[PDB]
């Protein structure tokens, strides 16, 4: 035909989007939303490059060009090997887990810091070649958060985090904001909370009975909490985590403005919140077999986990995230378990 | 003798400073003031390492040990070259200016950042194979912080600078508290404000109004001042800000807690108050050599200047600064002018 008479095709010209960490359990899920998805938000995915330091699966379903590799975004030429393929939109969401970050000094600024830098450059010196210019979205943390810490802490409160990784999050996040408001990509950084229920098996972080003590239950398994019920931290699904990093690639730069590092919503709940939920959506039967047994190593850690936020500015901009533990429960039902206990 | 009742000496065993940027105007007045001094507070200084990209002088009526070399911290090998003295006490107050760092981005980085990250390192190694554990007096500075702004500044309000000056010293700052609290060395952040009254001659930093429409008409000079009345900033005497390195090196770190770097206290006052005080202070005659020109390109810069900050923990920990200008342009004809207009 040869007559229009307006606007035709659904979609842009397609995309090529990276993924940073694309083996991690928020990487794969954030994969597989895209595929299923199609686009983002009227850009057909065209291309994923997929790099994280262990092997990331193509995933099931794409039909476009994929580069799943292994490699170590702080080993030498790797950050200048993706950014000479040009991704469109990069997520950043590899880092070595706080646990090994701090038992580890060179390894945890290695690969947390100077990888995230080398990216940055990288990203930079293209921009100044060709104009080059990517969405970035990047993977911070709650750890940027130190005690004392009030409750809800606000969206103005200082980074003064106690541990490595989150001062390794804290500049980067730094950094991100200073490339962006040159010119050199549009970042955006993201602030997880923790996530809850994490999939999967017990990982043996201090934290990790938060998911435990739900997970395990829910299909009939024993778990152990070692800290009262009065204890109070900030948590959302893994689905509201990507929701969050779709979001965050989609968003207007100039309604963020340039303070581009944003506090997540979320839900602050108690321990003993949990487990009212908990009996609420699966019975008497699954709270019997939490077994509550002292331990006072992770109790004195818990004044160190923050215990919620206002998340004023994320809300204003359109990120959302469960308001109840029964949502949260509810969520890893239909998303992990087939939506039926039996 | 032989008998002795109870302690007998003044001093302890002598001490090495190192000042970095010791060629700058802060630099040379706490090199002077240590040599006056004498001792900080009870170890006598037996030691000066001065290092500036500009060649230090030796300070007058200093009878001990001096290493005044021009260096670039940034450069292969001179981070180790200084830890290898091993300096007690290290005031690391150098830096590329923010206007410089604007236009050059590889420079500011790899001076603001790079070099104080190698210096940072160079002495944790040195913790690490000898328990080399420094006092480190950093300069950091209200540029950390970004609009938009509240007046007056609380303390836990986070730093979230608008230029690549402001975000080497906020990321500076970080590494600062991680590498303090990791047990390398003795860190102490100091957020310097606007210093003024300036010495020297009008600097063509947008800014250098604050200071020259003080400066020049004390000595009988023209002074234009560019901005109206109502433009509100945050200052301190190049006295106090020597008081500040002074203290930060002696201050018992666990009353700092792991929040090392502090804002420090001065003074929040408009032009309109600073031209009061020079009329009070110094007469008609003086306000009448101030030229208004308006410049619209300063008048602009001006919302971007933090107006003043609470001060709070900086005060209770025993850091003070001029609270009224009038005290300010006294420690100028004191400090710069032989304490008499004629």
């Keep these: 035909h040869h007559h229009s008479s307006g606007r035709e095709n659904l979609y842009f010209q397609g995309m090529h989007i990276a993924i940073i960490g694309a083996a991690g359990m928020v990487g794969r899920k954030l994969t597989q939303r895209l595929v299923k998805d199609g686009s983002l938000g009227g850009k057909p995915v065209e291309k994923f490059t997929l790099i994280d330091v262990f092997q990331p699966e193509a995933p099931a379903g794409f039909s476009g060009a994929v580069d799943a590799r292994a490699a170590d975004l702080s080993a030498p030429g790797e950050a200048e090997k993706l950014v000479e393929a040009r991704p469109d939109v990069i997520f950043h969401l590899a880092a070595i887990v706080s646990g090994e970050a701090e038992l580890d000094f060179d390894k945890g600024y290695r690969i947390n810091l100077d990888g995230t830098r080398y990216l940055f450059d990288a990203i930079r010196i293209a921009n100044g070649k060709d104009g080059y210019k990517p969405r970035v979205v990047f993977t911070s943390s709650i750890a940027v958060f130190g005690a004392p810490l009030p409750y809800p802490i606000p969206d103005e409160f200082h980074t003064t985090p106690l541990t490595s990784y989150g001062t390794q999050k804290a500049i980067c996040e730094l950094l991100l ?166």
Tied chains: 1, 2.
């Design 177 to 342: 904001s200073d490339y962006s408001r040159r010119g050199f990509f549009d970042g955006i950084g993201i602030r997880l909370p923790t996530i809850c229920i994490r999939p999967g098996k017990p990982n043996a972080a201090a934290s990790g009975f938060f998911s435990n003590i739900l997970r395990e239950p829910l299909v009939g398994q024993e778990a152990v909490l070692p800290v009262p019920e009065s204890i109070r931290h900030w948590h959302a699904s893994p689905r509201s985590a990507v929701g969050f990093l779709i979001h965050g690639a989609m968003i207007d730069v100039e309604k963020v403005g340039p303070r581009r590092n944003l506090s997540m919503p979320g839900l602050s709940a108690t321990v003993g919140e949990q487990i009212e939920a908990l009996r609420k959506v699966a019975g008497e039967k699954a709270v019997a077999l939490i077994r509550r047994e002292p331990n006072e190593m992770i109790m004195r850690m818990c004044e160190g986990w923050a215990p919620g936020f206002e998340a004023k500015r994320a809300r204003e901009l359109g990120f959302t995230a469960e308001s109840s533990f029964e949502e949260i429960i509810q969520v890893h039902i239909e998303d992990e378990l087939g939506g039926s206990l039996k």
